[PDB]
A paper describes a structure:
ChRs consist of seven transmembrane helices and a retinal chromophore covalently attached to a conserved lysine residue via a Schiff base linkage.
C1C2 yielded high-density microcrystals that diffracted XFEL to about 2.3 Å at SACLA. The dark state structure of C1C2 determined at SACLA is almost the same as the previous structure solved by the synchrotron analysis, including the chromophore retinal, the interhelical interactions of the inner and central gates, and the extracellular water access channel in the dark state. (c) The structure of dark state C1C2 determined by serial femtosecond crystallography. A water accessible cavity is illustrated, with the putative ion pathway indicated by an arrow. The five glutamic acid residues lining the ion pore (E1–5) and the two counterion residues (Ci1 and Ci2) are indicated by sticks, and the three constriction sites, the inner, central, and outer gates, are enclosed in boxes. TM7 contributes essentially to the ‘central gate’, in which Asn297 forms hydrogen bond interactions with Ser102 (TM1) and Glu129 (TM2). The intracellular end of TM3 shapes the ‘inner-gate’, in which His173 forms ionic interactions with Arg307 in TM7 and Glu121 and Glu122 in TM2. The inner gate formed by Glu121, Glu122, His173, and Arg307 prevents water influx in the initial dark-adapted state.
Residue numbers in the entry:
A (entry chain A), B (entry chain A): 49 to 111, 118 to 328, 331 to 352
The structure:
């Protein structure tokens, strides 16, 4: 298939490589297999599943709400490019140091992850403003992706350093994401809405926590997983991080909207001691408009 | 210098290239010159100037205010990498399609540009919140950089399409940036503060507008400019977009702070008809707390 040189001869007892002078770049490292047919087959099935589910999610959202639509749109464009050019440059970058870097994946993260975090910063959909903490979440997450991409493009100690820089940015992201989910839990009404927020937190930390594990295991790290193997793992946590998380987030916004139509927007101030934070909780009746504090 | 193959022999009347089987990648396209010694010399001088000015800006900011510090820090790290590894992968990506892509530049844009726009969304430094429009500015600017980077990595019609996708994201960014500067102008006190905001708008639109022009002229476009030539142009608009803009922005925040200490925080509602928008203007005396409308 390749649009780099794939035909060569070994000469002088394997010490010389001769290639056609046809303008193409050449490197042995680029011709290593991407994995077994079973790994490839598994990857093509999960991709169709993700494309189908993203199209179902899109039509379903088509009946504010813009973050779920933007991510599902990017996911669709991603699949059409994978289907036609998955291993064509620059969906995969084949670089002079011999690396294969899945630019398609990192570009998708730069497009979708900040939007997931904007959604996280307004889980109820009622806020018209965003605090200073939202800005730190976005700046830390962009840095994480930039350091991780740089680590994947590098080798040796340069890779290790940029990976560690990504991990420090990532920890700052996780820490601040955790505070938002804690605020969200004490903001939404007392019943089912707190089940969904709890569900979204589990999906978020498990799926986002898997990305650094898949990096270390993949060709970008210790080469335990092949390229197809890494694709299979990444589409699974894509389904959790994007499709399932967005579905719950959409459901949560529907429940908040139904609550406000039936009961109106009645708030109670709750205080969170763990640091001193203030949150305006939604309640069901006017017997609550007080100043409560919940110790963690 | 290179850590790709630079030694080869032409055989069979220039129709065959033979190289050592030493594990290195090889491509003729990678060995094209980066430019003249004069272009290189010009580029090394402007880089020292930018590193020195970024260090002066850092010490000066060292006497909220975090956006100027974050950008000046990234600029410093950028210079230490340029000084030691400017043309080493992956500061430059040498890819299988023959392209040289200055990943160092695009990674810096992903780190600094969103932070410049967060600063723009709070020019006075008094806001504790950010509106919905801030989020569209950040999401549009990230997309611009992602499409532009993808265009630089591509060739032929693929490059043209991703460039046009960047231009559409970019126009949305410029349009929304223009509204913010219009709001900022009618928000800050009537004298010198409105001169600085006007100055920051000119710096912003001229320096940001030059990036797509330098893309079209550089190796990523029609190859009018060489690599050193493109570096020289980019450090100039870096000085305008980052160093000079941040300096004015810091100065503006100092003037707003002095105004509020001497006069207190007294606001007047002004309305902007061009769409109907509301802005809380800072004034000097209590004879103003009314509802004015300024027709554009
Ligand atoms: C050609 O190079 C090959 C390298 O594979 C040489 O073959 C090996 O020679 C070494 C001796 O240093 C043995 O230890 C290996 O068992 C050999 N075979 C293999 C498969 O590695 C070979 O000797 C060289 N021929 C000449 C004429 O120099
Ligand atoms: C070797 O290839 C070269 C290609 O440069 C041939 O040289 C040219 O031959 C063409 C004829 O098709 C002329 O139009 C050019 O003027 C020649 N010189 C140059 C500098 O381009 C050469 O003929 C080939 N030799 C053999 C034995 O096939
Ligand atoms: C907060 C999220 C929770 C999850 C946290 C997960 C922790 C994983 C840490 C591993 C550090 C080990 C260093 C990893 C460096 C990877 C780079 C690499 O593989 O280097 C290649 C090597 O130089 C040649 O084979
Ligand atoms: C809003 C900001 C104001 C400034 C706006 C600036 C307008 C520049 C537009 C040019 C379009 C022309 C198409 C550009 C495509 C570039 C890709 C290219 O050079 O293609 C290489 C070619 O395929 C092989 O040589
Ligand atoms: C999960 C993906 C669907 C199930 C696996 C499909 C597949 O590729 O099966 C190959 C077969 O098991 C050969 O070993
Ligand atoms: C979102 C990011 C996109 C990744 C880039 C995907 C771009 C795929 C380009 C396909 C390609 O290589 O084009 C060659 C051409 O079709 C034959 O001449
Ligand atoms: C660990 C690296 C530092 C994390 C990257 C920098 C985070 C951005 C930052 O400092 O933002 C603070 C802002 O005030 C939020 O409220
Ligand atoms: C905290 C204060 C700011 C300094 C932080 C990191 C310096 C290292 C930057 C990373 C450069 C790596 C390049 C390389 O290893 O070459
Ligand atoms: C602007 C950079 C400083 C002035 C140009 C320095 C330089 O490189 O001059 C080369 C000389 O002009 C040879 O033609
Ligand atoms: C901010 C983005 C960084 C760009 C990446 C710059 C990283 C420069 C790495 C230098 C390199 O190529 O390292 C080789 C090594 O020093 C010899 O074995
Ligand atoms: C032209 C491409 C579309 C621009 C990229 C999408 C912008 C993001 C968006 O739609 O954000 C709207 C948000 O509500 C802001 O207030
Ligand atoms: C507006 C509604 C959304 C569709 C927008 C763009 C489709 C084209 C996506 C870009 C794919 C380019 C890849 C290529 O050219 O191959
Ligand atoms: C839809 C795709 C998602 C949510 C992707 C998320 C990606 C990350 C959270 C990446 C995390 C990384 C680290 C924490 C450090 C090492 C480098 C990364 C980029 C793999
Ligand atoms: C400090 C560096 C700055 C402010 C860089 C800004 C970069 C841009 C505004 C890039 C703009 C582009 C377009 C509008 C479309 C084509 C692709 C880009 C990325 C060159």
């Amino acid at each position: 298939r390749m649009l780099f040189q794939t035909s060569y001869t070994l000469e002088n007892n394997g010490s010389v490589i001769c290639i056609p002078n046809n303008g193409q770049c050449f490197c042995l490292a680029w011709l290593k297999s991407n994995g077994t047919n079973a790994e490839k087959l598994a990857a093509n099935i999960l991709q169709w599943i993700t494309f189908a589910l993203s199209a179902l999610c899109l039509m379903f959202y088509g009946y504010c709400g813009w973050e779920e639509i933007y991510v599902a749109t990017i996911e669709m464009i991603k699949f059409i490019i994978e289907y036609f050019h998955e291993f064509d440059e620059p969906a995969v970058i084949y670089s002079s140091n011999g690396n294969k870097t899945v630019w398609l994946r990192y570009a998708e993260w730069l497009l979708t992850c900040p939007v997931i975090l904007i959604h996280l910063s307004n889980l109820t959909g009622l806020a018209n403003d965003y605090n200073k903490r939202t800005m730190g979440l976005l700046v830390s997450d962009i840095g994480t992706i930039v350091w991780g991409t740089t680590a994947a493009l590098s080798k040796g100690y340069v890779r290790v350093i940029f990976f560690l820089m990504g991990l420090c940015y990532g920890i700052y992201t996780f820490f601040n994401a955790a505070k938002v989910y804690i605020e969200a839990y004490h903001t939404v009404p007392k019943g089912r809405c707190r089940q969904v927020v709890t569900g979204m937190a589990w999906l978020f930390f498990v799926s986002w926590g898997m990305f650094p594990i898949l990096f270390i295991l993949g060709p970008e790290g210790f080469g335990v997983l092949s390229v197809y193997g890494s694709t299979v793992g990444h589409t699974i946590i894509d389904l959790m991080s994007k499709n399932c998380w967005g579905l719950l987030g959409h459901y949560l916004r529907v429940l908040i909207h139904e609550h406000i139509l039936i009961h109106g927007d009645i708030r109670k101030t709750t205080k969170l001691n763990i640091t001193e934070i203030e949150v305006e909780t939604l309640v069901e009746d006017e017997a609550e408009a007080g100043a409560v504090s919940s110790e963690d």
